[PDB]
UniProtKB/Swiss-Prot annotation, chains A, B:
<protein>
    <recommendedName>
        <fullName>Protein S100-A4</fullName>
    </recommendedName>
</protein>
<dbReference type="GO" id="GO:0001837">
    <property type="term" value="P:epithelial to mesenchymal transition"/>
</dbReference>
<dbReference type="GO" id="GO:0005634">
    <property type="term" value="C:nucleus"/>
</dbReference>
<comment type="subunit">
    <text>Homodimer. Interacts with PPFIBP1 in a calcium-dependent mode. Interacts with PGLYRP1; this complex acts as a chemoattractant that promotes lymphocyte movement. Interacts with MYH9; this interaction increases cell motility. Interacts with Annexin 2/ANXA2. Interacts with TP53; this interaction promotes TP53 degradation. Interacts with CCR5. Interacts with FCGR3A; this interaction inhibits PKC-dependent phosphorylation of FCGR3A.</text>
</comment>
<dbReference type="InterPro" id="IPR034325">
    <property type="entry name" value="S-100_dom"/>
</dbReference>
<dbReference type="InterPro" id="IPR001751">
    <property type="entry name" value="S100/CaBP7/8-like_CS"/>
</dbReference>
<dbReference type="GO" id="GO:0005654">
    <property type="term" value="C:nucleoplasm"/>
</dbReference>
<dbReference type="GO" id="GO:0003779">
    <property type="term" value="F:actin binding"/>
</dbReference>
<dbReference type="InterPro" id="IPR011992">
    <property type="entry name" value="EF-hand-dom_pair"/>
</dbReference>
<keyword id="KW-0007">Acetylation</keyword>
<dbReference type="GO" id="GO:0048306">
    <property type="term" value="F:calcium-dependent protein binding"/>
</dbReference>
<dbReference type="GO" id="GO:0062023">
    <property type="term" value="C:collagen-containing extracellular matrix"/>
</dbReference>
<dbReference type="GO" id="GO:0050786">
    <property type="term" value="F:RAGE receptor binding"/>
</dbReference>
<dbReference type="GO" id="GO:0042802">
    <property type="term" value="F:identical protein binding"/>
</dbReference>
<feature type="modified residue" description="N6-acetyllysine">
    <location>
        <position position="32"/>
    </location>
</feature>
<dbReference type="GO" id="GO:0005509">
    <property type="term" value="F:calcium ion binding"/>
</dbReference>
<feature type="binding site">
    <location>
        <position position="64"/>
    </location>
    <ligand>
        <name>Ca(2+) 2</name>
    </ligand>
</feature>
Length: 87, 87
């Protein structure tokens, strides 16, 4: 179960970062699709365009306006750490 | 199912962490069964005690001789990224 889940995390990235432009990174449209479709829970209601834009600015540690796989990775793990702490 | 993939990530850990001493930490021995029954395709056959110490040394970033939930998400991000760079 831990192995199908880790490649569920891997294949999901590529599910959107390749739709447009750099096929190795998520741009905003791409990031919104992923979250909106694959991660609605950890979504709540902040569905503005203003919620997503700092939603993209905070995942984007490099500041290169895109989320690479690494970065998606630190995001998934913050979300893991956050839930854990809850249960 | 990404959100499904996070669920089991967080639970797989506690399924093993709550056996001995700290219940929110993995000691070399709980890590052992986690790694062996969960991530079998990552541990080939170097499973002696040096490939299992190594790992512990590897995993345990604060060096309290135990794997906590954050050091376990760092490790997991290392597996996914490995799976990723190979595509
Ligand atoms: Ca892209
Ligand atoms: Ca970036
Ligand atoms: Ca323990
Ligand atoms: Ca530790």
């Amino acid at each position: 179960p831990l192995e199908k889940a880790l490649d569920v995390m891997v294949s999901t990235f590529h599910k959107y970062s390749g739709k447009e432009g750099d096929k190795f990174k998520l741009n905003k449209s791409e990031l919104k699709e992923l979250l909106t479709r694959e991660l609605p829970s950890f979504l709540g209601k902040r569905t503005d365009e203003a919620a997503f834009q700092k939603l993209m600015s905070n995942l984007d540690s490099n500041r290169d306006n895109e989320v690479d796989f690494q970065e998606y990775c630190v995001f998934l793990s913050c979300i893991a750490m956050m839930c854990n702490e809850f249960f």
